[PDB]
Structure formats: C-alpha cells, structure tokens
C-alpha cells in the first residue's frame, strides 16, 4: 500500500552517515 | 550408517521405488563411492585438517615373499607384497600399516617413488616401508632380514574406493559379513547431507529424461520418445 | 572401476540403451579418454600438486638394438628403440622407465631435445636415458655399452592417450586381459564426477539434435526433419 | 588420435551423417586444421610454456643445390634448398632440422631475416643455417664447403598447416599411407575438446540456416525457402 | 591454404550457393581482402609482435631510368622507378627489397619523407635506397652511380591490398598462375577462423535484407519487398 | 504479505554499522 | 502516484555530501 | 512456502562482519 | 509525462562535483 | 525442489572468510 | 520521441572529467 | 536437467581464494 | 534504428582516456 | 544449447589468477 | 543487422588498455 | 546462429591481462 515514515527516516539516515563521512575528512593542513 | 541407510536414502528421496526402474541400487553404489572421494578431496586437500575416525578402513592383507625381476640371482634383494592388489589410498589422511593391533610396531608406509632410495641410513635398517607398486600390489622392502617373516598385517588408510575397500575389510570379531550392504559407509556424518545432494542432483535430471522406448530400428530421441 | 563402469554410466546417463541408436559406447571411448587429458591438465599444470597412483599407467616394452640412420660406419653409435611407438606422455607426474622392477634401476626418462647433449660428464656416462623421439618410439642411449643388452623395460607415466597405453599393458598375474573394457580406467575418484558431467553435457546436445532421416537427396536440416 | 576419429566426431556432433549434406567432411578437415593454429597460439603464444609432443610433425626433405640468382659467377655462393615447398611453423615450439635422426647434427633453423649475415663468428663457419624464404622453399647456407652434400633432412616443428605436413610427412617402417585420414591428427590430447567445440559452433548454426532451393532466376534467401 | 578455398569457406557458411543471387565471390574477394588487413592492423600495431613468414608477399619489379621532374640538367640526379605502381605496404612488418635473392645485398626500403634527406653521410653512399611515392611507384635514389644499372629487384613486405600484390606475384618453378583464386592467400592461420568470422558476420545480415523487387518506378524498400 | 520487524532491525543495524565506520575516521590532528 | 518533495530533498542532499566530499580533498601546497 | 531461521541467522552473521570491520578500524591517537 | 528542469539541475550538478574532485587532485609537484 | 546442505555450507564458508578478513585488520596499537 | 542536445553535452562533460582526472596523475619524476 | 560437480568445486575453489587470501593478510605486529 | 556518429566518438573518447591514464602511470625507477 | 569444454577452463583460468594473486600477497614479516 | 568491425576493434582497445595498465605494474625490485 | 572464434580469443586475452596483471604483484622481500 503506502506509508513513508520508515522509508524517510531510513534514508535520511543513510545520506546523514554519508555527510558525517565526507565532513570526517576535512583538513586544515599545517607546515607551510 | 551402512551401505544399506545410504543407497536407500538415494533412492527415496528420487522415489525409485519400482523393480521395472532405469536406475538401479548399483548405479547408486557407483555415484556414491565416486562422489565420496570427490567430496573427500574438496575439503581435506586445499588447507591440512584434521581428518575424523570415519573416512578410515582397516582393510586386512595376506603377504608372501616375491622376487625382485625374476629368478635370477644378481637382481636384488627379494620383497614381499599382498597376494591380491591393494585399494589406491589418498593423500589426505594417516595411512598406517600395522601389525594387526594399531598401537605397536612401525611399518612405514611412504610413496611409490620414495621407496626406490630408501633404507641407506644406518639407524633405518631395521625399518620395514611400504608402498603400492604400478602393479596394484603393496610391496614391503627392509635391510632388515627378519621383514621375509610376516604373515599379515592390516591396512588403515583414506582409499579412494570405499566399495573396492570394503571388500577386503577384517574380519569382526562376530565373523565376516556376506553383503556389502551390511559394512559401514566410510565418511563422516557431517558430509552426508552434501554427498547425498551431489547424488540426488546427477540422478533426478537423467530420473525425467526420455527413452527410446519404441523398438523400430530407428533413434527415437530427437522425438522425445 | 575398469572402462565398463565408466563407459555404461555415461550411456545410462544419456539413457543411450537401445542398439538402434545415433551414439555408440565408440563415441564415448573417444569422450571419456580424450576429456581425461583434458581434467588432468587442466588440474595439475597451474602449480605443481601431488599425483595419485591412479592416473599413471605401466606398459610393457620390448626392445631391439637400431643403429643411428643406416649400415654405415661413420654415421654415429647405435640406440635401443622399442619395436611397437610409445603414447605420449603428459608433463605433469613421474615418468619412469624402469627395469621391470619400479623400487630398483636407473633409467631416466628425459626430454628429446635434451637428450642430443646427453652423457658428457665422467659421471653420467653409465645412466640409460630415455625420449620419444619423433619416430614415435622410445630410443635410448648410454655412454656405457653394456646398455645394448636391455631386453625389456617398462614405462609408468601418465599418457596423453589412455586407450593406446591400456592395450600396451604390462602382463598381469592372471594372464593377459582380452577386452579392453575390462581393463582399469585411469582417472583418480576425485576427477571421476567432474570427468561424467562434462561428457554427458557434451553429447546430451547432439541427442535432441534433428535428424537427415529422409532418402531424398536433399538436405533437410535446416526444415528440422 | 587419427584424422578420422577427429573429423567424424564433428560429424556425428553435427548429425552430418547423410551423402546428401550440405557440409562434406571436406569443410570439416579445412576447420580442423585452422582451428587448431587458432588454438595453439592461443596457449602457447601469450607466455612461454612447455609444448608437448603432440603438436609437432616430422616431415622428410629431399635438398638440391641450387644458385643464388642465376649461373653467373659474381653472385655469391650457391645454397640447398628443398625439392618442394615446406609449410610455414608457428613461432612457438622447438623447430628441429636434423639429419635423419633427431639425436644428432646441428642444422640450426633461423630466420629469414637472420640468415642474411650469418657464419661470420670463426666458431660459426661449420654450422649449417635453415630459413624459409618467400618463395616457400627452406634454403640451406653455410661457410663450410662440406654442407653441399647433404641429401636429406627432417624437420620436426610445430607447422601452421598440419595438412601441408601431413603430405610431406616420413615414411614408416611399414611405408607410407597413401590415406590422408588414415594418419595421426597433431594436437595434444588436452586441447581437443576445446578444438571440437569450436568447429562444431562454426558450423552448426550454418547446419540449420536456409538455403535457396528453388531453381527461379531469383535470390531467395530473404524469403526464408 | 588458397584464395579458392578460403573464399568457398565463406561462401558455403554463408550458404551463397546459386548462381542467381545476389552476392558473388567478387563480394567476398573484397571483404577477405580488407578484413584481412583490418586484422592485422588490429592486432600487430599496439606492441611489437613476431610476424610470421605467411602475411608477406613477394612482388617482382621491373626498374626503368627516370628523369626528376623532366629532362633539365640543372634539376637532380635522376631516379630509378618500377615499370608498374606499387601496393601500399603496411607499418608492422619488415619490409625487403631484395635483388631476387632474399638473403643478399642491402636495398634499404625507407618512408617517402625520410629519403629526401638521405645519403649524406659518407658510409652510406652505395646503399640504395626506396620508398613508394605519392605517384605510387617505388623510386630509388643512391649516390653510387653503379646504381642505376640494376634491371629486376623484389619486395617482400605485408601489403594492405592483397589482392594487388597477388596481381604481381612471382612466377614460380612451374609458370605464372593465370587463375587470381588458385593463388596463396596471405594471412596466418592461426587468424583465419576471425577472418571468416567477420567476413560471415558482415555478409549474413544483408544476406537476409529485402530487396526492391517491384519493378514500378516506386522504392518498395520500405515496404520490405 | 507482510512484516516489518526483522527487515526494520537489519536496516537499521546496516546504519549503525555505516555510522561506526564514520566516526571511526574523526580525527584530531596534531603538528600545526 | 506522483509528488516530488522528498526525491528533491533527498537527492539534493546526496549532491551536497558528494560536493563537501569532494571540497574536502582541496588542498593548497607548501613546499617552494 | 517461507522459513527464514537460516535467512536470518547469515544476516545476523554477516552484520557482525560489519561490525567487526568498523571497530578494527578504531583508534586512540598519540603524538600531540 | 515529462520535465526536465530538475533532472538538468540534478546533473548538471552532478557533473560539477565530479569536476571540482577532477581539479583536486591537480598539484604542481617539487623537488627536482 | 529442494535440497539446501550445499548452500547452507558455502554461505557458512563466506562468512567464515569475511570473519577472516576482518580480524586480520585488529591491531593492539602501540607508541603511545 | 528524440532529442539528443542534452544528452550530447552530459556524456561530452563527463567525458571530460574522464579526462581531467586522468591527467592530473601525469608526472614527470626526479631523483634518479 | 542437473549436475552440480563441477558448480560445486568452481565455487569451492572460489572459496578457497577468499580464505588464502584472507590469511594471508594476518600479521602479528610488533615494535612496542 | 540506425546512426553511428555520436556512439562511436563517445565511445572512442571514453577509450582514449583509459589511454591517458595507462600512460600516466607508466614510470622508468631508479634507486638501484 | 550445451558443451561445456571451454566453460569449464575459462572458469578454471580465473580461479587460477585468484589463487596467484592471493599468494602474491603473503610475506614472512620481518623486524620483530 | 549485422557488421562488426567497430566492436571488435573498441574491444581490441579495452584489452590494450587493460594491457599498458597491467604491464605497468612491472617492477624490477632494489635495495637488497 | 553459431560462431566462437572471437569471444574465444577475447575472453583469453582478458584472462591473460589478468594473469600478467597478478604476476606483476609477485615480489621476493628482502632486508631480514
């Protein structure tokens, strides 16, 4: 039938794991 | 299990109940020995294990003196072997020769290829090898000259046919069996399920299969008959 | 198992048992002996593995004193050669020429390429050496001349045809064996249920396939007769 | 193997068994034999293996002295060259020139391109050279005057065609076989179903494509007759 | 093999056997010949390879005295050109012009742009030099002034038109072929089964397309007639 | 049919494996 | 049937971990 | 027909494997 | 039916991040 | 039809090489 | 239905990131 | 039809270079 | 139905920068 | 239809390579 | 239809530049 | 239809870029 409370949160959920991801290997760099 | 727990699971899982049946208990017995050794070399040869008291028989033999060529005397030291040829074994256990009780005497049992060099240190003189000949026989070869005065030894190995070996098993304290039917199935239980499989699925294909059944000097099959 | 046992598996397989039929057991002696050369290569070429005693044969052999090309003097010294051609041996175990006795002799079965530069040390100038040279018969040489009085050798290898090796057998205790289907099919066990499937697989193609069954000097494959 | 075990099991794989066929055993021997050139550079080309024995043909040559260009003395030296065209080897075996047995002489088979400045090395002046040129006779040169005398030669080598060698190929002690099916087929044991199963997919979806059989002035082949 | 045999190879799989339809061996002349060398552009171009003695071709030339651009004085010191134009030879052999000998005499066959700088330094005045012009004859310049005195010479080299290299083939032992399809056709054999493949490939498709069959004065293509 | 309390379990422990796998590269860096 | 305000947000979002990933390996040197 | 004991137990397996993979990955630094 | 405003800007983005992490790896290397 | 003893043991056998793979990774770290 | 002038300049722009990353790795090395 | 001796020792020898390989990732380190 | 002019300059493009990136890692060492 | 003669070693060839890689990996570590 | 003189000659090139790829990976390894 | 005598030459010639490609990784370690 229909409903998305769990196809929403789960997949909020997986692009949130994928932007905890990217922004784990931010740098500022040292030794100039 | 016997032999008879064996074939007959075979059979009633592709419900082979019939005497008029294309597929009878000895197509069995030969797709369950064959897929014994195949089942057997799959997981024991890749990486060493440890081996179970299961894919083991103790065959029995009967030794008698033999020449080396001929009767001539300059061709060597004389051997004993088996009087009837011995089952092929693997290369996957512990075969072991022994003087009718396992836990006494050291009969080595080495390859073919290893015996033709061997006995020349001083300290394995005393030591009795064997190994299985392209002959089919066992042979038996040591320095030492009391080796000419066995009767019987007793064989425990992986071999490669569990009908061909079983045939030559020792005789029970109870006494022989006559059938094959009636000897123990020599592989662990934990590799029956998958022997089973291996069988049911190489038969039920071929169980469907059509026939030839009319008799009109012509082949048939292109019609599906 | 001899020829039998593996000839009339693959025919029950097919369900090939009328004598009315397209496919004989001389199509599956083709199959069976041609695919085993096929698995053993394909199975011990990669890296170098452990060969069971089942896939060599012994043959017997006899042998005749040949000279190098003809009567003349000049032409070089003569060989020993086998007086019927040998099969050609696969490169995967222990060829083995030996002097009807396999644990005793030294002839050394080699190359032929390298056997044209052969004895030339102070050592290696007594040793039999044997190749197939491209006659198709087993020569021999030595530096020693008392080589010339070899009678009889044998050869336990793993041929390439085992068709031509198993009617070259070495004489049992019995006595000789008539039919070849009674004679022992070379393959190990563990080869033996991937050796059936790639037969049947090859000819249960060809046994649905149609048919020219008309006698009317056209080609009626392609309408499906 | 001969020709006739390898050229009717593709018939009989292709049910080709009918007088009236469009494909005649003659389209079989042509597939035979390209496919087999196919299929050993396919092995032996990529990297280099052992070859066996099976591969290669002996063919025996009848050399005659013949000139450079033509009778005039300010040419160069004259070379041998064979009676008839040789066939053209694969680069990927052993090619062997050896003077009636294959155990002795160095007639050392090049290259066209090499053979051109060739003997110059003082070691190298009593080594005879073999190359092919572009006419297709293999030309014979050498700095010793002795070389002038040979009369026949072998050569053993993996050649192209194995029809073109199987023409050309040594006498037997019995004699020669007038039957071209009648001789042994060069490929190894361990390569012919490989080589079956690709001679029969080139003909077998041809085995049921349509034919213009109707004689109308017209191509009929879009009309599916 | 022949031009003959490998055209009705394709012919036969094709299945192209009356005479009124709408392919020919002329079709088949054209599609051997480019995808024969399509072919060997493909695999021979990429990293350096063995090319055998089967893809080349030997072509006989008849060298005539030609002028620079006319007959001026004050132009250049004149060429020699072949009576006939040249087949264009492809970039993965080694090309050979040789004076109807192969292994002899150093005729250096260079590019077209090469040789307008060539012959200046002092070692390489007497060695004669070609290349096919854009007028597609093959020149030959040297600073040797002997060099003009040559009447005949041979190119050996993998041409792209191999139907145009057969034209001015050799005459043999015998006598000049006069049949083109009785002529040896140029490629390895181990590349025929893809060269009959993509030549079936590339017919069989438009064997099957419809024709304008209607003579109305109206395109019945898109009415598949 | 239907029955969302093994499939919802497994999904959401996929999640927590991919978030165990994000926070396990945060990194304070050190050498400046 | 059809609305698309959550495959908006949610691919969106897919475009801005995939940019922030990428922005993250940007580096300006530091040797001569 | 449906019977998912042995459908759960490899999934519940292989999740484990995750887990196990990301928490071989974790670290407590050194060297500030 | 069909629109293409989004998936335009959903691609044309999406190459733009997979241009950007072409041009962060582009360094002009040292020491020679 | 059924007969499942095969891939019960080869999606055992999977499993067992990705345990393998994971704690072939664990490490005990060290320089504190 | 056809239109090929946005499907020309995606594969034509992604063919260029193909390429831009491929010629961020070309080097010409030192210390020999 | 069926045959499953040849499906069987080509996913057994694919399981196999799992494994060896898996093993032949394991180190017991050193240098405390 | 048939046109061979965008797929096979597409086509050749995306094989040319495998190409470029083969080359790009092709290197003559040193420190023997 | 079916012949399994070229099947059989393609497959076989692959489970080969997966093997030479897999001991192309194995070392005897040093510096303990 | 059929022709195929473009897919075999797109196929000769992945091959070679799965080739120039493989081949540059061979190292003739010092310092020992 | 039938014809093999391509993706036979094909599918060897991918799996001898995968041998050489495996063979290239073989490395005999020194300093022990």
């Given at each position: 039938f229909g409903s998305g409370a769990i196809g929403y949160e789960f997949d909020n959920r997986y692009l949130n794991n994928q932007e905890m991801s990217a922004?784990?290997?931010?740098?500022?760099?040292?030794?100039? | 299990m016997t032999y008879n727990e064996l074939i007959?699971?075979?059979?009633?899982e592709l419900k082979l109940s019939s005497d008029d049946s294309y597929y009878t208990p000895d197509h069995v017995i030969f797709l369950l020995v064959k897929y014994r050794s195949f089942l057997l070399k799959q997981?024991?040869?890749?990486?060493?294990?440890?081996?179970?008291?299961?894919?083991?028989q103790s065959i029995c033999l009967d030794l008698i003196e033999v020449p080396a060529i001929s009767?001539?005397?300059?061709?060597?030291?004389?051997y004993l072997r088996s009087k009837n040829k011995v089952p092929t074994t693997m290369?996957?256990?512990?075969?072991?020769?022994?003087?009718?009780?396992?836990?006494?005497?050291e009969i080595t049992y080495i390859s073919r290829d290893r015996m033709r060099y061997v006995g020349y240190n001083k300290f394995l003189r005393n030591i009795i090898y064997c190994s299985?000949?392209?002959?089919?026989?066992?042979?038996?070869?040591?320095?030492?000259?009391?080796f000419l005065h066995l009767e019987k030894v007793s064989f425990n190995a992986i071999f490669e046919d569990?009908?061909?070996?079983?045939?030559?098993?020792?005789?029970?304290?109870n006494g022989t069996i006559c059938k094959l039917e009636d000897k123990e199935f020599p592989?662990?239980?934990?590799?029956?399920?998958?022997?089973?499989?291996?069988?049911?699925?190489?038969l039920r294909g071929p169980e469907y299969s059509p026939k030839d059944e009319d008799n009109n000097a012509k082949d048939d099959l292109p019609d599906a008959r």
């Open positions: 922004v784990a290997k931010q740098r500022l760099t040292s030794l100039p | 007959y699971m075979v059979l009633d997981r024991y040869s890749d990486i060493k294990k440890q081996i179970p008291d299961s894919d083991y009767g001539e005397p300059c061709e060597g030291s004389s290369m996957i256990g512990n075969p072991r020769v022994y003087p009718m009780d396992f836990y006494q005497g299985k000949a392209p002959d089919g026989y066992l042979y038996f070869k040591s320095w030492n000259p009391q569990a009908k061909e070996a079983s045939e030559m098993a020792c005789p029970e304290e592989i662990e239980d934990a590799l029956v399920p998958p022997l089973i499989e291996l069988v049911v699925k190489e």
